[PDB]
Design a protein around this ligand. Structure first.
Ligand SMILES: *C(=O)[C@@H](NC(=O)[C@H](C)NC(=O)CCCCCN=[N+]=[N-])[C@@H](C)O
Ligand SMILES: [Cl-]
Ligand SMILES: [Cl-]
Ligand SMILES: [Cl-]
Ligand SMILES: [Cl-]
Ligand SMILES: [Cl-]
Ligand SMILES: [Cl-]
Ligand SMILES: [Cl-]
Ligand SMILES: [Cl-]
Ligand SMILES: [Cl-]
Ligand SMILES: [Cl-]
Ligand SMILES: [Cl-]
Ligand SMILES: [Cl-]
Ligand SMILES: [Cl-]
Ligand SMILES: [Cl-]
Ligand SMILES: [Cl-]
Ligand SMILES: [Cl-]
Ligand SMILES: [Cl-]
Ligand SMILES: [Cl-]
Ligand SMILES: [Cl-]
Ligand SMILES: [Cl-]
Ligand SMILES: [Cl-]
Ligand SMILES: [Cl-]
Ligand SMILES: [Cl-]
Ligand SMILES: [Cl-]
Ligand SMILES: [Cl-]
Length: 454
């Protein structure tokens, strides 16, 4: 089944590297297609005939439970657009070890591996990693920062849409994330581009391959296509307080006599500051609790109320024509990535991600917990001590003070909130352009409202 061929494919690649090095084949010689073909064939025959011991990270009980879960509850994905395919990867946050996965609805009927082989746009699940997470990390926004959701156009003149909405007005980062509003994400990424932030540095530290970093819709999944395993690794990084561990299924390959052919080497990388990662955890907790873009917390509370009280965080994504839905879930211990879609890329139903995938993944998480009762853990995500707490105006997301509004020096006061920052000084004093993005006209409208409240 999926585990047999995924493991075999990975073992063959590791055996290929080992045999080429054993036989002293040069980097140049390895560029020869006929030489590569011979070493791939030799690697396959070595595994087939060689009596090697392959040690995997797979938890057999959990992986078996996940197979039974998709066999029993995969039909919950069928939304009237034909048989819906699925991929899931369960990853240990502290190691990057893959404990189990779902390759698809039924290997016997369709062998395509939707966990490791299929690449699709991760849509709005890109936003925490590539837009908001980097902006917080660079000290360009805090947890209660205000962003523009005022109407604006892409470079080609097309309006930035959210369902049938051309946008609203100013909103908090929390509102922007809970709803997955697009314009705030667009402005956040535009700010990173304008400031010359090395976004590629962050994304490549987590193993992402993105060909063009200038794509305006990168936060909404434009110009990015990922496997479920790779994208699970991005969420692993945020859940693990910003420390990436490279995903793996193979831990070790030994000859019969115990000679080590290959052994996974942990190379932990602090991709985001502990402050950034823990602030993002708090925001993604509210994405699930708000239930705006996913019913997951309602589904899970019914199936397993004790498990629903674990510290779940996560994020949804939907591609433009509903071809792909994503739900990424973490507790402190584990991350579970989930994709659904069609092999031929045709549209799912409008609510496929919101309801069907959420219900299926609640069943999958419950199946995992029944197989391994302690595996999700009862630990909480918590702000790192390095987080800076700033008292800011709810209205501006910046500290109270004086601003020039249409000539007149205005004393900006009102309701305050604690905003979490990952810099040294926390939130700046309120300035006229207090929000991420927005036009002159937007700011005239926003300030008119705020002044009206003093
Ligand atoms: C995150 O997943 C977000 N999804 C998107 O932004 C998605 C990639 N595209 C859209 O929702 C807008 C494209 C639709 C065509 C434009 N309308 N016209 N004409 C959120 C929204 O789920
Ligand atoms: Cl399998
Ligand atoms: Cl496979
Ligand atoms: Cl040999
Ligand atoms: Cl096991
Ligand atoms: Cl896609
Ligand atoms: Cl515009
Ligand atoms: Cl909200
Ligand atoms: Cl970049
Ligand atoms: Cl990638
Ligand atoms: Cl670039
Ligand atoms: Cl591996
Ligand atoms: Cl041997
Ligand atoms: Cl840190
Ligand atoms: Cl909740
Ligand atoms: Cl609900
Ligand atoms: Cl979404
Ligand atoms: Cl689509
Ligand atoms: Cl199909
Ligand atoms: Cl705890
Ligand atoms: Cl906390
Ligand atoms: Cl503080
Ligand atoms: Cl303060
Ligand atoms: Cl600072
Ligand atoms: Cl800005
Ligand atoms: Cl304007």
């Amino acid at each position: 089944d999926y585990l047999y061929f995924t493991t075999l494919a990975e073992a063959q690649e590791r055996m290929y590297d080992y045999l080429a090095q054993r036989d002293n084949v040069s980097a140049k010689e390895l560029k020869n297609e006929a030489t590569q073909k011979f070493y791939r064939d030799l690697a396959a025959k070595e595994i087939e005939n060689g009596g090697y011991k392959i040690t995997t990270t797979i938890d057999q009980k959990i992986h078996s439970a996940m197979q039974s879960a998709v066999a029993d509850y995969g039909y919950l994905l069928d939304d009237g657009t034909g048989r819906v395919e699925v991929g899931n990867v369960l990853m240990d946050n502290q190691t990057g070890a893959i404990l189990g996965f779902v390759g698809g609805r039924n290997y016997q009927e369709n062998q395509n591996n939707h966990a490791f082989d299929t690449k699709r746009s991760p849509a709005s699940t890109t936003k925490p990693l590539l837009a908001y997470g980097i902006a917080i990390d660079q000290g360009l926004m805090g947890s209660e920062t205000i962003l523009s959701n005022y109407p604006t156009n892409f470079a080609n003149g097309n309006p930035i849409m959210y369902a049938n909405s051309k946008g609203t007005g100013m909103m908090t980062l929390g509102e922007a994330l809970n709803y997955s509003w697009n314009i705030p994400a667009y402005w956040t990424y535009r700010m990173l581009r304008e400031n010359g932030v090395d976004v590629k540095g962050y994304m490549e530290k987590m193993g992402y391959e993105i060909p063009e970093y200038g794509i305006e819709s990168l936060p909404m999944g434009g110009g990015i296509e990922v496997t479920v395993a790779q994208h699970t690794n991005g969420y692993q990084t945020l859940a693990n307080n910003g420390v990436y561990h490279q995903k793996h299924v193979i831990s070790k390959i030994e000859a019969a006599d115990g000679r080590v052919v290959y052994e996974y080497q942990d190379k932990p990388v602090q991709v985001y500051s502990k402050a950034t990662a823990t602030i993002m955890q708090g925001l993604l907790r509210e994405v699930l609790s708000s239930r705006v873009t996913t019913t997951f917390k309602s589904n899970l509370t019914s199936l397993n109320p004790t498990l629903a009280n674990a510290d779940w965080i996560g994020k949804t994504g939907t591609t433009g024509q509903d071809e792909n839905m994503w739900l990424m879930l973490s507790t402190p211990r584990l991350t579970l990535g989930g994709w659904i879609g069609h092999d031929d890329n045709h549209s799912l139903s409008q609510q496929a991600g919101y309801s069907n995938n959420s219900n299926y993944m609640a069943h999958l998480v419950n199946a995992i917990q029944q197989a391994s009762p302690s595996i999700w853990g009862n630990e909480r995500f918590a702000l790192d001590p390095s987080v800076v707490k700033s008292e800011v105006l709810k209205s501006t997301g910046q500290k109270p003070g004086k601003v020039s509004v249409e000539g007149k020096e205005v004393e900006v006061t009102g309701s305050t909130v604690t905003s979490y920052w990952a810099n040294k000084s926390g939130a700046p004093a309120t300035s006229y352009r207090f929000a991420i993005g927005g036009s002159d006209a937007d700011y005239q409208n926003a300030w008119s409202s705020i002044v009206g409240s003093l």
